[PDB]
Amino acid sequence: HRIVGYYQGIRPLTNDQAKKLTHLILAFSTPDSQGNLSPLSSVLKQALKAGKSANGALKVMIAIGGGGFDPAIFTSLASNSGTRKSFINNIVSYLKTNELDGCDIDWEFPTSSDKAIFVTFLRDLKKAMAPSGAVLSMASAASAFYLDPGYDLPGIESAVDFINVMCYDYYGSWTKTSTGPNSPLFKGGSADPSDTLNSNWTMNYHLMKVYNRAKLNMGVPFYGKSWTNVGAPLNGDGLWRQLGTYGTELAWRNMGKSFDMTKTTYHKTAKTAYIYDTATKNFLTFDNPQSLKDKAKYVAEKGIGGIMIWSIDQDDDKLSLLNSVS
Numbered sequence: 363h364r365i366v367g368y369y370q371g372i373r374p375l376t377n378d379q380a381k382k383l384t385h386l387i388l389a390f391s392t393p394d395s396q397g398n399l400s401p402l403s404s405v406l407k408q409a410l411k412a413g414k415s416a417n418g419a420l421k422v423m424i425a426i427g428g429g430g431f432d433p434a435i436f437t438s439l440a441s442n443s444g445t446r447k448s449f450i451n452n453i454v455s456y457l458k459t460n461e462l463d464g465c466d467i468d469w470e471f472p473t474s475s476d477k478a479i480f481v482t483f484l485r486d487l488k489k490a491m492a493p494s495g496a497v498l499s500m501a502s503a504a505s506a507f508y509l510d511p512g513y514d515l516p517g518i519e520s521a522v523d524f525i526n527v528m529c530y531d532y533y534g535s536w537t538k539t540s541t542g543p544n545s546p547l548f549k550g551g552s553a554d555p556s557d558t559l560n561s562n563w564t565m566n567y568h569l570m571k572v573y574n575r576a577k578l579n580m581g582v583p584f585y586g587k588s589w590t591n592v593g594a595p596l597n598g599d600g601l602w603r604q605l606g607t608y609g610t611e612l613a614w615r616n617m618g619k620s621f622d623m624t625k626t627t628y629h630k631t632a633k634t635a636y637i638y639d640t641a642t643k644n645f646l647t648f649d650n651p652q653s654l655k656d657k658a659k660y661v662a663e664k665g666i667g668g669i670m671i672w673s674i675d676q677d678d679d680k681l682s683l684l685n686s687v688s
């Protein structure tokens with residue numbers, strides 16, 4: 363159903379890409395301490411024009427905030443009814459001025475002190491957006507650690523048109539235990555030390571809280587993560603290996619020129635792709651056409667309302683990943 367594509371201006375949005383999306387979410391605009399939104403960058407502006415020109419049905423939205431963005435500023439703007447009201451008016455004015463069709467609130471992350479005020483902010487923002495038909499979404503966290511204290515999912519659901527669930531970054535630069543999958547679909551069987559660092563657990567968490575699952579999008583990544591100097595498996599399964607050193611996040615479009623993709627191992631239980639290169643001891647966890655196909659099937663099977671992608675511009679020139687997901 364929905365194909366919600368985040369876009370961060372790595373490269374121009376192509377006319378083929380625009381036709382494969384229902385929603386294009388430019389990323390990012392950030393508010394200052396007074397609720398003034400940063401102006402749309404040139405690369406984001408171009409993608410808006412390219413998307414609308416190539417797909418008259420496409421909704422082009424601005425994601426406000428982001429993983430880099432200080433969540434205490436969201437707290438400040440939303441907690442005060444006066445600043446909440448003016449921030450909302452600034453958002454609505456920003457949409458009209460920049461010819462946008464709506465916005466995504468990417469607040470990473472609301473704390474327990476934010477839980478109710480986040481819902482109030484989204485409900486009020488929806489009310490101001492409703493006459494123009496502007497589309498409202500938010501990005502949701504992937505673990506109970508964040509979800510339980512900070513996310514009133516029923517309340518959020520009552521306000522937004524859909525929820526973009528960030529089912530990725532399950533392992534990363536903070537991981538001290540072992541290598542592991544950035545975005546597996548499932549727990550990876552008996553060798554998996556975790557029940558929850560997978561998309562299925564995160565989506566099931568949301569399914570158990572929200573009224574209408576059609577309002578959920580399962581997020582998928584078009585990027586992967588690498589480690590170097592990686593050693594032996596911890597418990598007989600090559601996905602979880604003795605740590606060397608965190609590498610970086612790589613866009614899919616850049617993996618094939620640095621890794622021999624013919625060495626891809628596809629985990630049959632977790633539904634996730636990785637490469638361990640015994641020659642170099644480099645390790646890459648990523649998503650590829652196979653993992654994305656399995657995830658689209660999961661979404662259809664569970665009746666989830668859509669797929670969201672971070673980020674479509676990380677795809678290769680031939681749209682291997684976007685063509686696989688839809």
Ligand SMILES: *[C@@H]1O[C@H](CO)[C@@H](O)[C@H](O)[C@H]1NC(C)=O
Nearest residue numbers: 547548549562563566567631
């Ligand atoms: C997905 O998660 C649910 C609930 O956590 C669990 O019952 C189910 O077995 C999981 N599916 C797979 C294939 O791991």
